[PDB]
UniProtKB/Swiss-Prot annotation, chain A:
Belongs to the AAR2 family. InterPro entries: AAR2, AAR2_C, AAR2_C_sf, Aar2_N, AAR2_N_sf. Phosphorylated on serine and tyrosine residues. Keywords: Cytoplasm, mRNA processing, mRNA splicing, Nucleus, Phosphoprotein. The modification Phosphothreonine is found at T257. Component of the U5 snRNP complex that is required for spliceosome assembly and for pre-mRNA splicing. Involved in splicing pre-mRNA of the A1 cistron and other genes that are important for cell growth. Its main location: cytoplasm. GO terms for biological process: spliceosomal snRNP assembly; spliceosomal tri-snRNP complex assembly. The gene is AAR2. It comes from the Eukaryota. GO terms for cellular component: cytoplasm; U5 snRNP. This is A1 cistron-splicing factor AAR2. It comes from Saccharomyces cerevisiae (strain ATCC 204508 / S288c) (Baker's yeast).
UniProtKB/Swiss-Prot annotation, chain B:
Changing T23A: Reduced growth at 30 degrees Celsius. Strongly reduced growth at 16 degrees Celsius. This is Pre-mRNA-splicing factor 8. Residues 7-237 are annotated as: RNase H homology domain. The MPN (JAB/Mov34) domain has structural similarity with deubiquitinating enzymes, but lacks the residues that would bind the catalytic metal ion. Contains a region with structural similarity to reverse transcriptase, presenting the classical thumb, fingers and palm architecture, but lacks enzyme activity, since the essential metal-binding residues are not conserved. Changing D21N: Reduced growth at 30 degrees Celsius. Strongly reduced growth at 16 degrees Celsius. Changing D22N: Reduced growth at 30 degrees Celsius. Strongly reduced growth at 16 degrees Celsius. Functions as a scaffold that mediates the ordered assembly of spliceosomal proteins and snRNAs. Required for association of BRR2 with the spliceosomal U5 snRNP, and the subsequent assembly of the U4/U6-U5 tri-snRNP complex. Functions as a scaffold that positions spliceosomal U2, U5 and U6 snRNAs at splice sites on pre-mRNA substrates, so that splicing can occur. Interacts with both the 5' and the 3' splice site, as well as the branch region. Has a role in branch site-3' splice site selection. Associates with the branch site-3' splice 3'-exon region. Also has a role in cell cycle. Changing D22A: Reduced growth at 30 degrees Celsius. Strongly reduced growth at 16 degrees Celsius. Strongly reduced growth at 35 degrees Celsius. Present with 468 molecules/cell in log phase SD medium. Changing T104A: Reduced growth at 30 degrees Celsius. Strongly reduced growth at 16 degrees Celsius. Signal peptide: none annotated. It comes from Saccharomyces cerevisiae (strain ATCC 204508 / S288c) (Baker's yeast). The chain holds residues 1836 to 2069 of 2413 of the full protein. Component of the U4/U6-U5 tri-snRNP complex composed of the U4, U6 and U5 snRNAs and at least PRP3, PRP4, PRP6, PRP8, PRP18, PRP31, PRP38, SNU13, SNU23, SNU66, SNU114, SPP381, SMB1, SMD1, SMD2, SMD3, SMX2, SMX3, LSM2, LSM3, LSM4, LSM5, LSM6, LSM7, LSM8, BRR2 and DIB1. Changing D21A: Alters protein folding. Severely impaired growth. Strongly reduced growth at 35 degrees Celsius. The lineage of its organism: Eukaryota, Fungi, Dikarya, Ascomycota, Saccharomycotina.
């Protein structure tokens, strides 16, 4: 189990750690989060009490370094930093645990939710989407736009998701215009899976990461990316059986976890109705269709 | 965006543009089979591609052999239209290629956009107008060449005859739409109006009779009449 200590909490803030969250009052004696499960990526995120505008946060993996949070009063936000002095870090964490000034990552033992949401998400791939090479962790916020959004404006602060565009020369082979537009298998299997992602695990990892950025930061370009990657699979007549079964599990846990009050803005009626009821894969997503119909029958 | 009443004048500016109408591409007769079921028999169709400024009509005849062994023909017909329009653009010199293609049905937008990805600078646009180009097959010489075709074939027509010698492209396209609206509302009456006087003939190289200016105003009024009439007969007014 690993720890992310905080130097202090000078401003009132709601702090999230993965799917959990808790309120910290201005100058409350809070010094971080302990017992974080090893083996998964994690995200620690913030919403200031004064300005609920801008949710922001950091993706990280405790196996890649000792990380801590420190408020910056010039830039006005909680910043993740790496501590290179290992002895200094262990000494700090040990003292904070002794004084019991840390919250415990509150995982229930039955609960595989976080694993199920991050199964294919790797920190190495996160850092290729979020380019900031001098850090081992990655910053995301509500306002960051994607590379495809910038084509339709600061390149350094963008989300470099894989561009998917159904009406593009990449998606459409000359002389197969109708075939490739109505059945996207070529684009899924040859262009994207064989050509760009190399395997389905990397594809699912990007999909899972796009969902999580949409849910935790309200990042619109991330929501667009999540829906596009779902639609590309659902609009392909030829998809490996293992990929469909895994997609059903992935989406099931995403829909299960999504906040009920956010479904109106985070779920695209057209994509979901197409995928569940009109697409080639309309009969292949049993778990997802069942939870969607019982939880969001309005959307459909 | 979409073409509507508010921007009707754009059609007659000097940017090359084409209307594409696919209504008559996939045509069938419905009939009973010996067992008393229903079946369709396709007949020849055509794509109607028209430059509204010049009157140039590129009439691509769709021979029934293109449907042989194919499924979902109404959907295929939209993609076949898009393929043929794309091939026509590619066959024209660059300075003759359109800057805009306006489709008369919104269902052509995606098929045409996809077939024209190579031409990112050609704008594909819908229209809010209810243009009467489906009645093109009520023009006898056009229907005759479509029905006689035994193979795919492109046939070139000036749909305005020689009118642009005497009138503007806005008055010509306005007249063409009036004649086609009439033919669509009551074909027999419209054709009666156009042909009643045997002394006004259709030249071998024309589609419509050789009316004087004065006779065209009479004709247009009579077509202005018919369309209100059949509107009363239909609606009881
Ligand atoms: O007016 C014209 C110009 C040449 C043309 C033509 C060319 C392209 C499209 C329609 C018409 N060919 C014969 C028909 C009349 N002709
Ligand atoms: O029958 C009529 C009356 C209106 C119209 C017209 C004008 C623009 C569009 C269509 C029809 N005026 C001039 C053309 C003949 N017309």
């Amino acid at each position: 189990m690993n720890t992310v200590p905080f130097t202090s909490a000078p401003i009132e803030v709601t702090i999230g750690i993965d799917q959990y969250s808790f309120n910290v009052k201005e100058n409350q004696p809070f010094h971080g989060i302990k017992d974080i499960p090893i083996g998964h990526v994690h995200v620690i995120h913030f919403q200031h009490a004064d300005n609920s505008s801008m949710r922001y946060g950091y993706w990280f993996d405790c196996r890649m370094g000792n990380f801590y949070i420190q408020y910056d009063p010039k830039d006005g936000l909680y910043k993740m930093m790496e501590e290179r002095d290992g002895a200094k870090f262990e000494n700090i964490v040990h003292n904070f645990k002794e004084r019991q000034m840390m919250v415990s990552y509150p995982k229930i033992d039955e609960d595989d939710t976080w694993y199920n949401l991050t199964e294919f998400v790797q920190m190495d791939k996160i850092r290729k989407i979020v380019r900031k090479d001098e850090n081992q962790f990655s910053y995301v916020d509500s306002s960051m736009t994607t590379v495809q959004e910038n084509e339709l404006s600061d390149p350094a602060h963008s989300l470099n998701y894989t561009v998917i565009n159904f009406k593009s020369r990449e998606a459409i082979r000359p002389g197969h215009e109708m075939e490739d537009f109505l059945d996207k298998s070529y684009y899924l299997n040859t262009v994207m899976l064989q050509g760009i992602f190399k395997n389905s695990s990397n594809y699912f990892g990007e999909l899972q990461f796009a969902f999580l950025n949409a849910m935790f930061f309200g990042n619109y370009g991330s929501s667009l990316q999540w829906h596009a990657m779902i639609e590309l699979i659902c609009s392909s007549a030829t998809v490996p059986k293992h990929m469909l079964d895994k997609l059903d599990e992935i989406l099931y846990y995403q829909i299960k976890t999504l906040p009920e009050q956010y479904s109106d803005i985070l779920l695209n009626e057209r994509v979901w109705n197409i995928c569940l009821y009109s697409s080639f894969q309309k009969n292949s997503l049993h778990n997802t269709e069942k939870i969607m119909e019982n939880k969001y029958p309005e959307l459909l | 965006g979409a073409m509507n009443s508010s921007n009707y004048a754009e059609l007659f500016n000097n940017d090359i543009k084409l209307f594409v109408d696919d209504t008559n591409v996939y045509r069938v007769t419905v009939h009973k089979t010996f067992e008393g079921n229903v079946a369709t028999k396709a007949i020849n169709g055509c794509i109607f591609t028209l430059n509204p400024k010049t009157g140039h009509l590129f009439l691509k005849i769709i021979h029934t052999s293109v449907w042989a062994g194919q499924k979902r023909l109404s959907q295929l017909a939209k993609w076949k239209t898009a393929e043929e329009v794309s091939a026509l653009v590619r066959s024209l010199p660059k300075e003759e290629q359109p800057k805009q293609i306006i489709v008369t049905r919104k269902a052509m937008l995606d098929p045409l956009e996809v077939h024209m990805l190579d031409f990112p600078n050609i704008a594909i646009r819908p229209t809010e107008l209810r243009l009467p180009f489906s009645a093109a097959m009520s023009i006898d010489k056009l229907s005759d060449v479509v029905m006689k075709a035994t193979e795919p074939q492109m046939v070139l027509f000036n749909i305005y005859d020689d009118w642009l010698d005497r009138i503007s492209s806005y008055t010509a396209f306005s007249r063409l739409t009036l004649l086609l609206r009439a033919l669509k509302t009551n074909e027999e009456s419209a054709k009666m109006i156009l042909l009643s006087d045997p002394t006004i003939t259709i030249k071998s190289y024309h589609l419509w009779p050789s009316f004087t200016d004065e006779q065209w105003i009479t004709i247009e009024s009579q077509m202005r009449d018919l369309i209100l009439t059949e509107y009363g007969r239909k609606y009881n007014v």
